[PDB]
Structure formats: C-alpha cells, structure tokens
Amino acid sequence: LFKLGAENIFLGRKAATKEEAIRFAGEQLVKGGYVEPEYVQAMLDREKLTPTYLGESIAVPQGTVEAKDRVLKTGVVFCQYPEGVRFGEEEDDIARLVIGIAARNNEHIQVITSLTNALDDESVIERLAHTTSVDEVLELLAGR
Amino acid sequence: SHVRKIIVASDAGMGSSAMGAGVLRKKIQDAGLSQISVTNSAINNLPPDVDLVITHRDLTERAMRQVPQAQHISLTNFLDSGLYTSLTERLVAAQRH
C-alpha cells in the first residue's frame, strides 16, 4: 500500500517537541506530493484529540477524518529521533520512531497495521531507532 | 446471540485504536478463535450489533452512550499490556463458558 525508499526515510533527527516532529513529517508529506498544505495543521489537530503515540517508542501522526480530501496519495515518512521525542500521555511515553502518514479515504489504521505488523519484534524497533543505515531501514520494512 | 465481535474506538479512530486493534486481534487469532472478528473505527461510527466495545476510559462514557446495552471495556494506557493480557484471558474464558 505504500512506497518506501531513500526519499522518505529521515535519520538522526532532533526535536524538542512532538509538534515540531509532526510539522516536519507533515512538510515531507507535502513535499512528496502525498498531501496538500492543509494536511499539516490537520495532523496537529489530530494530535490534540489524543496522542498518536502507540507504545514501544513509536508514534504515527496523521490527519483528521475531516482532511481526507486534502490527501493526494497514500504515503508515509519515516522519521528517526534517536534521542527521543515525548509523544504519549506520560513523560515516559517517548518515541524514537515518528512515522508520519497520509492515507487515501481515511484508511490510516490500514497503514498503521502494516507498519506495526513489521514492528512486532522489540529488536526491530531498537535497530530502527538508532541505525545510521537507510538500506537497513528498507530491509527491515520491506516484508511489510 | 453469540459474542464474537470486538471493535476498538477512539476520538479519531486513526491512532491508538490502530494499536489496540492489532494486539487484541493477534491474541484472538493465536487462541484459534477464527470465529471472532476484529476491527476498529471512530466512536461516531459503532454498529448497534457490536457485542464488545473497547475504548480509552476517557471516551468509554461516549461509547456506552451510543450503546449502553453493549459491553464496554475501559483501558488506562495505550501499551497497558497487563490490562490487555487480563482482558484476553477473560474473553477466552467467556468463549468456552
């Protein structure tokens, strides 16, 4: 359902807040023609309703159901934050993997399900969180 | 009238709902309960025929309201493995029984 290559993998980023990380992911979704500009704020709007942190150092920010027509094509932006970005409810809920998603027809859970299926093992997340290799990222998510 | 439907709901039904659904789904499939179906959707969207509804305590009131006749299970944390494990064991017990 989604293409993954060097153009949508971003390693070794840093962000003081989840809002900055979400804005970067949103900017990259706009940059790759996945979404129109209005989708960036829609991702921030969705984050306010309830965090997109999914546990296990992963966050998957996406837009609201209201922004479905601002999505041009299903896409993901894989963003690595080795130092972590607080994303969940608690201060302990830190994400090192921030995966920005844009899904046609508000199908975000299908994209999330595909990603989390490939992230079912703790060793895979740890490796993805600190790797400096784009190729390794592609390998670990290629069976998705 | 057999309990076989489990659905997870949330504010947008595009975040926490995705993870909750996946984990529960996996456990159910592992238990050999192919008869039980698992899906996720926004709170605003919950079919009246649903037997089990799983949401975050902060929104369980809402789901109860849409269907207070349905069975609702409240969570506390997104990765609360302890709660998830307990709930699963329970459903299995209720399946046989």
UniProtKB/Swiss-Prot annotation, chain A:
GO terms for molecular function: kinase activity; protein-N(PI)-phosphohistidine-mannitol phosphotransferase system transmembrane transporter activity; protein-phosphocysteine-mannitol phosphotransferase system transporter activity; protein-phosphocysteine-sugar phosphotransferase activity. This is PTS system mannitol-specific EIICBA component. The modification Phosphohistidine is found at residue 62. GO terms for cellular component: plasma membrane. The EIIC type-2 domain forms the PTS system translocation channel and contains the specific substrate-binding site. Keywords: Cell inner membrane, Cell membrane, Kinase, Membrane, Phosphoprotein, Phosphotransferase system, Sugar transport, Transferase, Transmembrane, Transmembrane helix, Transport. The chain holds residues 493 to 636 of 637 of the full protein. It is found in: Cell inner membrane. The record marks 46 as: Stabilizes the transition state in the phosphoryl transfer from HPr to EIIA.
